[PDB]
């Protein structure tokens, strides 16, 4: 798994090529992979950690 | 460390996209300001880390403080230097500066020194020319130790890896933007490209299936597979080279 | 989108305020330190240039002792 | 180290003064 094969590279490309076309028709959801990387409660926690670092450094 | 960098299996400092429309992000250049800020801070720190160092019996007792910090001198080496018992590295440097003051090398021309009276006295040599390698070698001989008492009668790697892992997640969403963007730019010549390349990648992944254990031990490879045509046509070629 | 948009709009102001404030405090620590470095190198040169003359005094004094050992 | 080298320099300069006193012993030994 540390190496890649010619089988591994084509399977990585074809699975990634088929999922973007699976979004235009929207027969896949892909909502778990969106909001977990958005994570808007972390994004404000990122903001609140940025907000306190204004307050601590002033 | 080595003379070459150490290869690692986790990624090290992945790139940041620049084709991203920065009117929407407006933070790539400000994050770029942080990286050159950190590297200049890393430049000053690594420079500072480099620059912070740039019958009657006798009493014989082997003491606790037998140390080579103040090491004894031979009396010839003592009077050429001047000090009584300083150190061994100061003995080498004061000897080397004494030859450099007297200008004995040349006016090997630099290896051979002009042996003066004191230099012939401290080395017990009598040549006119002698290399400096053998001069400093006897300084390892001319120095004796001190005599005892005689009485007679991290987290930053995982932080970098997490930042390397999170930058890989940034490279995914930027590429996922631009494909649909260039599909919004051209829906024609990326779907015709898709319908060819996904067909081509379907061909490549389906190139390895007739090489299993019980797929070759049976005879549904050789017999009647002229529709296959792939093997059993090389027997006119492999026998012609003796491969059998 | 709206919870994402709320903390995507206020954040960039807090981003570029902090990074610019980081530029202030870091460069202030630089100009303090790069001028404290120059005051070292003077005393590093001044301690050497006297001890170099001290060692030249010590080697010339041993050569003056040679005159005091030939007259005995 | 800004304090250390001045602590070492003036000690060497005072050692130059006591060595200068040893020169005065060379001015009265003969």
Swiss-Prot record, chain A:
It is found in: Nucleus. Its main location: nucleus. One of its GO terms (biological process) is transcription elongation by RNA polymerase II. It comes from the Eukaryota. One of its GO terms (cellular component) is nucleus. Keywords: Acetylation, Cell cycle, Nucleus, Transcription, Transcription regulation. Present with 3550 molecules/cell in log phase SD medium. Interacts directly with RSC8. Component of the two forms of the RSC complex composed of at least either RSC1 or RSC2, and ARP7, ARP9, LDB7, NPL6, RSC3, RSC30, RSC4, RSC58, RSC6, RSC8, RSC9, SFH1, STH1, HTL1 and probably RTT102. The complexes interact with histone and histone variant components of centromeric chromatin. Component of a fungal-specific module (HTL1-LDB7-NPL6-RSC3-RSC30) within the RSC complex. Required for cell cycle progression through G2/M transition at temperatures higher than 33 degrees Celsius. Component of the chromatin structure-remodeling complex (RSC), which is involved in transcription regulation and nucleosome positioning. RSC is responsible for the transfer of a histone octamer from a nucleosome core particle to naked DNA. The reaction requires ATP and involves an activated RSC-nucleosome intermediate. Remodeling reaction also involves DNA translocation, DNA twist and conformational change. This is High temperature lethal protein 1. The chain holds residues 16 to 73 of 78 of the full protein.
Swiss-Prot record, chain B:
It is found in: Nucleus. GO terms for cellular component: chromatin; nucleus; RSC-type complex. One of its GO terms (molecular function) is structural molecule activity. Keywords: Chromatin regulator, Nucleus, Transcription, Transcription regulation. InterPro entries: SWIB_MDM2_dom_sf. Coiled coil: none annotated. GO terms for biological process: chromatin remodeling; nucleosome disassembly; positive regulation of transcription elongation by RNA polymerase II. PANTHER family: SWI/SNF-RELATED MATRIX-ASSOCIATED ACTIN-DEPENDENT REGULATOR OF CHROMATIN SUBFAMILY D. Interacts directly with RSC8. Component of the two forms of the RSC complex composed of at least either RSC1 or RSC2, and ARP7, ARP9, LDB7, NPL6, RSC3, RSC30, RSC4, RSC58, RSC6, RSC8, RSC9, SFH1, STH1, HTL1 and probably RTT102. The complexes interact with histone and histone variant components of centromeric chromatin. To yeast SNF12. Present with 2470 molecules/cell in log phase SD medium. Component of the chromatin structure-remodeling complex (RSC), which is involved in transcription regulation and nucleosome positioning. RSC is responsible for the transfer of a histone octamer from a nucleosome core particle to naked DNA. The reaction requires ATP and involves an activated RSC-nucleosome intermediate. Remodeling reaction also involves DNA translocation, DNA twist and conformational change. This is Chromatin structure-remodeling complex protein RSC6.
UniProtKB/Swiss-Prot annotation, chain C:
The chain holds residues 415 to 486 of 557 of the full protein. Dimerizes via the C-terminal coiled coil. Interacts directly with HTL1, NPL6, RSC6 and the N-terminus of STH1. Component of the two forms of the RSC complex composed of at least either RSC1 or RSC2, and ARP7, ARP9, LDB7, NPL6, RSC3, RSC30, RSC4, RSC58, RSC6, RSC8, RSC9, SFH1, STH1, HTL1 and probably RTT102. The complexes interact with histone and histone variant components of centromeric chromatin. This is Chromatin structure-remodeling complex protein RSC8. Present with 3380 molecules/cell in log phase SD medium. The lineage of its organism: Eukaryota, Fungi, Dikarya, Ascomycota, Saccharomycotina. Component of the chromatin structure-remodeling complex (RSC), which is involved in transcription regulation and nucleosome positioning. RSC is responsible for the transfer of a histone octamer from a nucleosome core particle to naked DNA. The reaction requires ATP and involves an activated RSC-nucleosome intermediate. Remodeling reaction also involves DNA translocation, DNA twist and conformational change. The modification Phosphoserine is found at residue 71. It is found in: Nucleus. Residues 48-72 form a coiled coil.
């Amino acid at each position: 798994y540390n190496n890649v094969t010619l089988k591994n590279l084509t399977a990585f490309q074809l699975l990634s090529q088929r999922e973007n076309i699976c979004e235009l028709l929207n027969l896949v959801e892909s909502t778990e992979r969106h909001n977990s990387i958005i994570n808007p409660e972390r994004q404000r926690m990122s903001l609140e950690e940025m907000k306190k670092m204004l307050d601590a450094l002033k | 460390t080595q003379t070459n960098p150490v290869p690692v299996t986790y990624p090290t400092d992945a790139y940041i996209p620049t084709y991203l429309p920065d009117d929407k992000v407006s933070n790539l250049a400000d994050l770029k300001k942080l990286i050159e800020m950190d590297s200049r801070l890393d430049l000053y720190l690594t420079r500072r880390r480099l620059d912070t160092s740039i019958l009657r019996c006798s009493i014989t007792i082997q003491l606790r403080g037998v140390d080579g910090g103040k090491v004894q001198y031979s009396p010839n080496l003592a009077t050429l230097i001047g000090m009584q018992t300083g150190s061994v590295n100061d003995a080498v440097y004061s000897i080397y500066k004494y030859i450099l003051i007297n200008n004995l090398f040349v006016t090997p021309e630099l290896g051979e020194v002009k042996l003066d009276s004191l230099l012939q006295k401290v080395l017990d040599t009598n040549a006119a020319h002698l290399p400096l390698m053998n001069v400093v070698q006897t300084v390892n001989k001319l120095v004796s130790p001190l005599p005892p008492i005689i009485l007679d009668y991290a987290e930053d790697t995982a932080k970098l890896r997490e930042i390397t892992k999170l930058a890989l997640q940034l490279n995914s969403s930027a590429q996922k933007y631009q494909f649909f963007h260039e599909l919004s730019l051209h829906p024609r010549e990326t779907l015709t490209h898709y319908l060819w390349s996904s067909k081509q990648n379907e061909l490549v992944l389906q190139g390895d299936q007739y090489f299993n254990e019980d797929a070759a031990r049976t005879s549904d490879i050789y017999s009647n597979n002229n529709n296959d045509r792939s093997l059993m046509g090389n027997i006119s070629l492999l026998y012609s080279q003796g491969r059998l | 989108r709206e919870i994402s948009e709320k903390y995507i709009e206020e954040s960039q102001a807090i981003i570029q305020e902090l990074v610019k404030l980081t530029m202030e405090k870091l460069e202030s620590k630089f100009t303090k330190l790069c001028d404290l470095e120059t005051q070292l190198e003077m005393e590093k040169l001044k301690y050497v240039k006297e001890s170099e003359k001290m060692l030249n005094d010590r080697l010339s004094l041993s050569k003056q002792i040679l005159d005091l050992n030939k007259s005995l």
